[PDB]
Amino acid sequence: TLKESGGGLVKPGGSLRLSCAASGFTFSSYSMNWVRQAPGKGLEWVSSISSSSSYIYYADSVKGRFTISRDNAKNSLYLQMNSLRAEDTAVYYCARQVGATWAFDIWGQGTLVTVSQSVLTQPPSASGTPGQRVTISCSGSSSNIGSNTVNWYQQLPGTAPKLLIYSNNQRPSGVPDRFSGSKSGTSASLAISGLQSEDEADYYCAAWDDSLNAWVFGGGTKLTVL
Incomplete structure (x- = not known):
């Protein structure tokens, strides 16, 4: 029920791609997000894609560099990260949103992405x-x-x-x-x-x-x- 993947080590200006395999719910019905958390710092919202794939929002910190996406057929949500910086180093979680109240009821374990108010x-x-x-x-x-x-x-x-x-x-x-x-x-x-x-x-x-x-x-x- 939401397992992240694709995390690794990358150099600045590098490129990386995360994925989030869903299980137990109808993936295609709920909207999905990516919320990162730095090393010991707070939560920061990255991006959000509707189940419709029609309404996308990116955080002004990753605007243009990141690319959210999904494949409701394969039951997996993705995130293409390009032009990476050391400040993009965090743990990325993928959270299921509720249509009704917009809250994130199901969050994944996380995947660490390291880069060498x-x-x-x-x-x-x-x-x-x-x-x-x-x-x-x-x-x-x-x-x-x-x-x-x-x-x-x-x-x-x-x-x-x-x-x-x-x-x-x-x-x-x-x-x-x-x-x-x-x-x-x-x-x-x-x-x-x-x-x-x-x-x-x-x-x-x-x-x-x-x-x-x-x-x-x-x-x-x-x-x-x-």
Whole structure:
């Protein structure tokens, strides 16, 4: 259920091609994305292709150099990376988008690509003691959070992200009651009630920016439990 491939070592100005074999769902029905993550840094959205293959969006950082694509027949999504730079070094994940709410419910394991500020304002770290209530607030513009539904994703150390809250406050089929989402115009807050030890993870808030026509991802918040 989403396996990346084609990762390797490349030199600057080089060229590389990723692929993402789907399994268990009707690939052709859902839109697909590529979201990279640097070495120890946050999440950055790369590109998105509709199942229609008709509506493509590239991040202003890879605009022109990268080429998204798919083959709904072979059940695999691809990404042609040309004119590569050292700053393109990351882990690339391919995330299944939902037609309805635009959230990324299924993410792949990742593939590392080695080569030889932000709109969303999120506190870098959060400190909480067992059993307390912890709020992580993410601050966007009138063009993103203001105008579109927010999705929070939890990244557990080592593991790829997992949709925590979507459509501003909806808990998916798994996420416990202690987690609650909300939005107040241009700001969005995730509230963990009854802090547990297991809740030690990285939290990201993400909205679509109609002005940038790209997803904006939060600056992450590392929640440490005491």
